[PDB]
Amino acid sequence: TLTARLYSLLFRRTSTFALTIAVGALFFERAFDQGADAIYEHINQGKLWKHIKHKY
Amino acid sequence: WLEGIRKWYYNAAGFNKLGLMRDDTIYEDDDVKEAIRRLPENLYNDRVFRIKRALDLTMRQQILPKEQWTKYEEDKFYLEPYLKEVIRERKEREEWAK
Amino acid sequence: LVDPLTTVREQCEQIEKCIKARERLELCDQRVSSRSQTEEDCTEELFDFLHARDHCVAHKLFNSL
């Protein structure tokens, strides 16, 4: 199973657990920030400063 | 008749739904631990298991099935004779004190 | 320049609630006007009309703006 391989490759050791958490947070911060910012800009398209900097 | 109202209140209280009996829910005031200590072994064991089961049920927010409810006529006041003696002894000590 | 606010007022004064508020308003108007020494003010019925009209106006208007 994929989950079993993930466990007894990268979850058994608590120190490996911490390393996994650290790298996962490193990537998750970027992914979540990008996604949330894209969604928020999509909702208010044309109503933010970044959408009207080109005009002026 | 008053017994109808007593039955209604017994059903409304809900401690029977947990399998408990009247004396299993009494607040343990200073007289109550002494009364409990004087209980015979078998009554004490049954009481402690019943209370443990009640706590188990309330942790899961569940009740006993309708069949296993302590009916009002089957409820026994096991503690009452001991509690009366403890209270009487306390009253006698107080009367001698004054 | 034709203000969209004025046109919204015009079409939104047709709502029958506005109709009753307005007719009550003149029913205050002639009563206060004819009565020389009276302290009554038609601000009450005017406020009723203003509320009834402006809720409707708030529903409309911003779409045109």
Added chain:
Amino acid sequence: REFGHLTRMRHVITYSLSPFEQRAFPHYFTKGIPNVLRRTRACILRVAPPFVVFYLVYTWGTQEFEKSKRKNPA
């Protein structure tokens, strides 16, 4: 109060299972919804009436303020 002199038990057996063997959501909706409905049925006839009469009082007072506030024909 530390473990060891809490109480006295005899002839009590507790069977339990590992958290890694059970499902953390065993019949979450199959059994949970009936239990929540039963609990609501047991409690509502005692909790609701004071709040509904509070709502009646609140509405009555809120309407009472205006007509005392309203113009008196005179």
Added chain:
Amino acid sequence: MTNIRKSHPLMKIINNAFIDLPAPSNISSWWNFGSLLGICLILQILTGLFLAMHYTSDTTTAFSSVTHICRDVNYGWVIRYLHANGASMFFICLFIHVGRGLYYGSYMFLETWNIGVVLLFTVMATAFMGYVLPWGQMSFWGATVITNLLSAIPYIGTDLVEWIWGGFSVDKATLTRFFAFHFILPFIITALAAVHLLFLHETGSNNPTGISSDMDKIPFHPYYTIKDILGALFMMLILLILVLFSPDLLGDPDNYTPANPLNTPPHIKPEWYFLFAYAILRSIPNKLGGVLALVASILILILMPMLHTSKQRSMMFRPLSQCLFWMLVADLITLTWIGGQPVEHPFIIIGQLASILYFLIILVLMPITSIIENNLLKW
């Protein structure tokens, strides 16, 4: 040779106070509020400090400094509104905690109950002095009214009021001493909370059933750490919703006006969590009687362990007592709403009836009803 967790002195105290503490197995979600308040307290302190580093407690600059915090300090607005709405959450959790204690017969713990009453009084004082600091119209005038309340006490009266004022009325000196008292008090609250926990631990905790749970105690760490963490996450959800979606939901707009002593705002109401007292204030025509009723409303919690007559500790098996308690809660919301509203014919009578009912339920209805229940249950 021995585990550090239960051999090192500080570690031993932490272990037998938060890790290996035997707690009842069936404590409901309400008990979680005990943790939340403490967390709120930390959230009140840790955020509050960061406001003290850009707030100048001077009349000429207090409001301007707060506006500077919210408009120019990097992420300052988050700190300010987090603080305000967290104080509101603190009072919400405090009221729910008192309700839990009253409901499930917890006031038999006596010492913990009295320490809790003292903590409650200290928290209300802290919030009162806190609201003044922004030096808005409502802040200034609410401080004026609440301090002028103390003029009702006989003899000393005006002298005590001016002593608090540091002058003839509220002014720069009053603002400064309010800021200093506000800074010091929460640490006293923290010490008192430590004493509260110390007193509580000697006897354990009251489970919802009210019976002794010595036969079902479980270690604290595996279960209740994560349970209270879930509770704190829920409280953070509510608090963050309040801060980031309606920051001024529980807040008068007029506090965003610089305090002008020459204009009385049309409405003078305290914070939302004081209205229940203030409404009682409005109920009693006599000023001295009003102040005595205001203090007695909170002081009545001390009488509760003496006013309990039912032979059942909890309220879980007591229906009529439950109905009475929920009527009491509804009366509390009624008092809050009445205090919010001004003082006219529709509200005066309602306030009088609400105050009378609030005292009557605690002092009369609840004990007599407990007697009725004991008689009805053959004991």
Added chain:
Amino acid sequence: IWGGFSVDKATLTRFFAFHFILPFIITALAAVHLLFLHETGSNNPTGISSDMDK
């Protein structure tokens, strides 16, 4: 730490806030100090254990 580019209003206000809070931390640490001390008892000038003469 300056809250800027020199010692100014920001630094003064932060210093006031930290000066306010810190002594309470000192009080807590002093309580911990006394706690740690009591598990072993005070040391006499002679250095020898004073368990017999207390």
Added chain:
Amino acid sequence: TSDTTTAFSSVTHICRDVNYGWVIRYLHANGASMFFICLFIHVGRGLYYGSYMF
């Protein structure tokens, strides 16, 4: 106050205007020195009689 514009003046207002204010101000100022005198003597006592073994 904790503002650059009204810090120093405020302190003078403590010494010159507050009833019995100079006594509190100079009590703090000199109590700091007493605190440090006692702290240094305490550290010296710890060094001398080997109390650092705790």
Added chain:
Amino acid sequence: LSRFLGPRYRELARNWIPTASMWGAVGAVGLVWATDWRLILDWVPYINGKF
């Protein structure tokens, strides 16, 4: 509560009334001295000159 009172408690009260009254006098004197209560202090002879 009614559990008190009776024979033994009344002579306890009588025995402790002198001490309790002396403690009340102690409190009264300490109060009037601490706050410099004028109303009383324009009557005691030598301290009248304080004001």
Added chain:
Amino acid sequence: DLELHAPSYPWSHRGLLSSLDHTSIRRGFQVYKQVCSSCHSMDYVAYRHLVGVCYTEEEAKALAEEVEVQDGPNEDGEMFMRPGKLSDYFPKPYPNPEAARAANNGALPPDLSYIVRARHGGEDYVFSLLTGYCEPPTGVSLREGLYFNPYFPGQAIAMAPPIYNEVLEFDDGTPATMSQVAKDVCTFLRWASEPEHDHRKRMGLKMLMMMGLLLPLVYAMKRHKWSVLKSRKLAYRPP
């Protein structure tokens, strides 16, 4: 007595995750520049806050350079004029607060830095109050120099009617109809009261997603650890 509460207008930012229409913010700043700043004042916000919100840096510095601002002591201690910079707060039309009352009938124009967040009702009030002027009803005479406005408490404002159609010319070229001017200036005032509005909504979106992620997982962890106790089966076997 009586007061008329403002109707809940459908503002662009009324939405739970909506943002101020920054083009309308720019137009509203124009309105404040050539209408409200003449007698009304705004202090807590400065030209610096304009960048990245409604004006670019060049436009903001030009706007600051247009006005004249008093500075500190001269080489001999004089009060020399100076072209305003980006770090300058919006000039106050009247030097002392009493001079504002003296120039007017006697009521000072409140500062707009918080008027949206200080008036009960919000923009709906400030908008409607501008677009709510009407002839007084019969039977209520107003003093000379006073004006009747139903939404203003007391129904007696000291404003000359500030906003009327074709008062100013927007740089964009949108029609200058009175309703448009009122809406744009109201949006600008909302921005003035809450500059962090858009950032607050963005962080709120992030918080909503983060909690919708965390709460199920933490609840799952709680269920996992508590499942030892929620599945225990007791038994009693007395002799």
Added chain:
Amino acid sequence: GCVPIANAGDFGGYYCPCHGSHYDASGRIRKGPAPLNLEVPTYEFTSDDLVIVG
């Protein structure tokens, strides 16, 4: 303070007819939702140029 008629008016030196709260020569409000008249301060009247006012 809605544009009062200070030192003038049909009544005495005070008048504020923005609202129903008018005034009088003694300051009494003729009508209006004003809580009271123009506020009277406690004046320990010795005489002119001797009266104590706050």
Added chain:
Amino acid sequence: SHTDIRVPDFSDYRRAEVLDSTKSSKESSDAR
């Protein structure tokens, strides 16, 4: 009497992997 002690049926709670009584537990321990 110790022989009479029998663990009640927990099959209502056991996960899908550890459900059969003749399939060991080590093979699915990693996955669970």
